[PDB]
Write a protein that binds this ligand. Structure first.
Ligand SMILES: CCCCCCCCCCCC[N+](C)(C)[O-]
Ligand SMILES: CCCCCCCCCCCC[N+](C)(C)[O-]
Lengths: 86, 183, 81, 222, 183, 183, 183
């Protein structure tokens, strides 16, 4: 039982960790560009998209490795919990 | 006079004075308020006072309790932290109850934390306890261990007399006469 | 069934509404800010964060309080013959 | 300023007696009154020597002295209804003494109690004591078991007793002890998860047979 | 005069005075208001007073109750925290009731906190209780244990006389005469 | 005069005065309003008053009721909290009813809080009750236990005479004469 | 004059005055308006007044009723709260009706709150009732219990005479002559 609760909790915890950094940078870029467009009055609306695409892709390059190490370790763990009973 | 220590707490100063006096060293306690207490001795006694401060590793460190590692002011708690706080409060409440028995001066208690695991999928292990106590002079220690064991046994869901360790000791000789002043 | 579901989901809907109104209020000082697009970046993280806190009661909530029981047969069925 | 003027507005509550050691003795009836008196002396409201006494304390002190100089005397209790002439109850069967020895004992007691003028020694019957105990239990209709020894008798009252039984039992024991003291009969009250209230039986081919008493008991499933 | 302790609480000072008076040490309590109470003694008695303060580990601490670990002002209560508060309130209410019996001066009570597992999906274990009490002088303790056991047995859904431990003691001798002043 | 206690409330002050007068200590109560009550005694009686204040653990604490652990102000209420409040109100209402019986001076009552489980999915346990009460002198206690049991039995859906514990005691001797003033 | 109590309510003050007069203590009630009522006595009677105030636990607390735990102010109510308020109102209305019977001076009633479980998924248990009442002197109590039982039986859908407990008592002797003033 507690193994079930633990594994289910951890799933949500990993979602949170992995998704957190891209969504942070997409937020910060959204705020900065929105402010800049009030500091100098320009009514463009694709500029956020153009910048935040580069912003998100860059950090996907950076974190490409840790993403695979975390998921491998988790998969091995849950396969053990499922099968290794005696 | 030479300065030994500065910025002490009240509870650190009185313990230092007690240990110096026991070895016949006359010491002086001075209060500087926001700067705390200072302790001074005469030159003929300076060497000895230094050697005893080293031997007892004074001033004393503050008392440690497990609840301090998991402050209740957190915004999140795991089951593990909650369970730890629980046991870290039962231990203290038992020590405080034992000090009320007949002629006990002070005591200490320890509980086996299973909390470091969930005992996941396993029948959870039984509890173990340990206690130390200091009695007044002329106490029949042998006859008093039974009472303590009896009292502890029923404080928990499953405890065996075999799993309870109790160690007792008598108070040392009283330090009543004052130390002599250096000539 | 619908009642039970709403009663249980409510805590998350509330926080996500407060979040979006908060952003809309903030937008008043910087009208070029796309407060809508910001909320899409934020709300999924907020959702998972909050549900992670209220996650552990899910085990007892369903296992006993919602499971049907043999005693109820008396009220849902009767004999017409 | 007499001492009686310092003890209070109620006068009869205390009794002041002079003693041969040139000291005043204040006789009290209970602990509460004893402390109400002792406070006056220890505060120093009185200038000369004085002492406070009661029946329980003196029974204890005398027993301590008897333990040393008469380590084999069988006796019950000393009554101080009239504090100038105490009554000492000795067993008739268990003691062998001459008249002379009894007189000497009397004089030594008088030396321990400088406030008493004489001590009366009276011989009592053990069968009488034991009988009055058993009759009091039957009269209350408590369940019990009796056990006899060369030097005493025990009554054991045990089981899942009711509130009413507990109350009546404790009242009776408290009453009897005041009269005869603890030295010969012991009453033991112990609650158990046992609805038979200490009875026990074995089922054989001949049916039920009553078990002898003992330590171990069968906790009731019922 | 030498300062022993400063910034004490009222309840925390009267205990120190009590312990010193018992050993024939004349002490003085002074009030500084926002700075609390101060305790002072004469020089000839300073050494002894220091030794006793150490030996009894004075000043006393605040008393602990488990409800202090799981404050009701939290954002959320786990079932564990609710269950703990509940038990930690029943304990106190029982102690306050026992003090009303005839002759009892003080008492303390403990319950087995089975809550250290949720019992979720487990058959819940039986309760165990322990109690300590102090009596007025001249009380037949043996005859009085029965009343206590009887009273506690019915306060819970499932308790056996076998699972209740009770320890009783008498009050010490009264300290009525004042200590002598140093010459 | 020496200060024993400060900042009392009315109901603490009167209890302390009562307990000192019982032991022949003349005390004085002074009211400072926003600062509360103060209690003073003479020097010859100071030592004794300190010893009794320690022994009885004065001043008293406030009464504990389980409803204090579960304020209705919380945004969420589990079933557990509601059920707890309910029982904690019934207890108080029964106490207040027993005080109306003939001769009863005061009483206390306890109920088995099975609310320490939800009984979710389990058949609900039977109720257990305990009562303590004090009577006027010259009351046939044995004959009055029956009345109490009879009255309590029908106050709940399922109670057996076997599951009701009742303990009774008489009022102590009246303290009518005033204590003597120190010479 | 010595101050016993201050800031009393009118219904508390009249209760204290009644209890003191019964014991031959002349007392005085003073009104300070927004500050409430004050009670004063002479010095010769101060000690006794203190001892009786302790023995009766005066001043009386306010009366408890279960509807106070479940205020309607909230936007939400479970079935449990509504059902609780309903029973808590029937209890009061029955007491008010019994007071109108011939000779009855006061009464109190208790109903089995079966709502301490929902009776969800389960058959509802039968009702139990208990009542206490006080009569004028010279009333045939034995012949009056029948009427009460008959009246209460039909107030609920399913009640058995076996499940109704009734306890009756007579009024004490009248206090008509005034107490004597201290010399
Ligand atoms: C619009 C892009 C959505 C991508 C979602 C998946 C993110 C992980 C991509 C694989 C790891 C990073 N990398 C650079 C190797 O691609
Ligand atoms: C969408 C989750 C993040 C992208 C990574 C998914 C796991 C891909 C497999 C990882 C393999 C790691 N590797 C190369 C060390 O074996």
């Amino acid at each position: 039982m507690d193994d079930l609760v633990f594994a289910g909790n951890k799933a949500l915890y990993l979602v949170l960790i992995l998704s957190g950094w891209p969504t942070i940078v997409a937020t910060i870029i959204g705020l900065l560009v929105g402010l800049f467009q009030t500091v100098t009055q320009l009514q463009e609306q694709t500029l956020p998209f153009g910048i935040k695409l580069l912003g998100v892709c860059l950090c996907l390059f950076l974190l490409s490795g840790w993403y695979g190490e975390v998921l491998l370790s988790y998969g091995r763990q849950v396969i053990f919990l499922a099968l290794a009973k005696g | 006079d030479k300065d030994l220590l500065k910025g002490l707490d009240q509870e650190q100063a009185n313990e230092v004075i007690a240990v110096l006096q026991m070895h016949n060293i006359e010491a002086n306690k001075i209060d500087s308020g926001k700067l705390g207490y200072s302790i001074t001795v005469a030159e003929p006694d300076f060497t000895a006072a230094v050697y005893w401060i080293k031997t007892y590793q004074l001033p004393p460190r503050p008392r440690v309790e497990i609840a301090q590692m998991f402050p209740a002011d957190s915004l999140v708690s795991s089951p593990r932290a909650e369970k730890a706080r629980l046991y870290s409060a039962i231990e203290q409440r038992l020590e405080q109850s034992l000090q009320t028995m007949e002629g006990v001066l002070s005591a200490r208690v320890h509980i086996s934390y299973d909390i470091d695991a969930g005992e996941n999928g396993r029948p959870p292990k039984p509890v173990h306890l340990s206690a130390l106590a200091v009695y007044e002079r002329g106490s029949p220690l042998a006859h008093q261990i039974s009472d303590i064991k009896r009292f502890l046994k029923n404080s928990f869901a499953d405890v065996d007399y075999d799993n309870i360790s109790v160690v007792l000791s008598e108070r040392s000789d009283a330090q009543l006469q004052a130390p002599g002043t250096p000539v | 069934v619908a009642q039970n579901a709403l009663v249980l989901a409510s805590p998350v809907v509330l926080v996500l509404l407060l979040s979006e109104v908060f952003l809309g209020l903030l937008s008043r000082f910087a009208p070029q800010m796309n407060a809508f697009a910001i909320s899409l970046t934020v709300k999924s993280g907020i959702a998972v964060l909050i549900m992670l806190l209220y996650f552990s009661p899910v085990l007892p909530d369903n296992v006993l309080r919602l499971s049907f029981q043999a005693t109820g047969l008396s009220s849902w069925f009767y004999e017409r013959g | 300023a007499e001492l009686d003027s310092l003890l209070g507005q109620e006068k009869e509550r205390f009794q002041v007696l002079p003693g041969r050691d040139k000291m005043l003795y204040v006789a009290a009836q209970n602990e509460r009154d004893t402390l109400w008196a002792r406070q006056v002396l220890a505060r120093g409201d009185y200038d000369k020597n004085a002492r406070v006494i009661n029946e329980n304390e003196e029974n204890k002190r005398i027993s301590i002295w008897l333990d040393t100089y008469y380590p084999q005397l069988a006796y019950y209790r000393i009554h101080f209804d009239e504090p100038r002439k105490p009554v000492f109850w000795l067993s008739r069967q268990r003691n062998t003494m001459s008249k002379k020895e009894l007189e000497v004992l009397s004089q030594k007691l008088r030396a321990l109690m400088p406030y008493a003028d004489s001590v009366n020694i009276t011989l009592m019957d053990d069968v009488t004591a034991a009988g009055q105990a058993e009759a009091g239990l039957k009269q209350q209709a408590l369940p019990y078991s009796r056990r006899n020894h060369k030097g005493g008798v025990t009554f054991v009252i045990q089981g899942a007793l009711d509130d009413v039984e507990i109350l009546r039992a404790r009242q009776f024991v408290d009453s009897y002890y005041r009269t005869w003291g603890g030295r010969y009969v012991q009453f033991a009250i112990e609650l158990k998860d046992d609805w038979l209230k200490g009875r026990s039986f074995q089922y054989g081919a001949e049916g039920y047979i009553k078990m002898s008493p003992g330590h171990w008991y069968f906790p009731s499933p019922l």
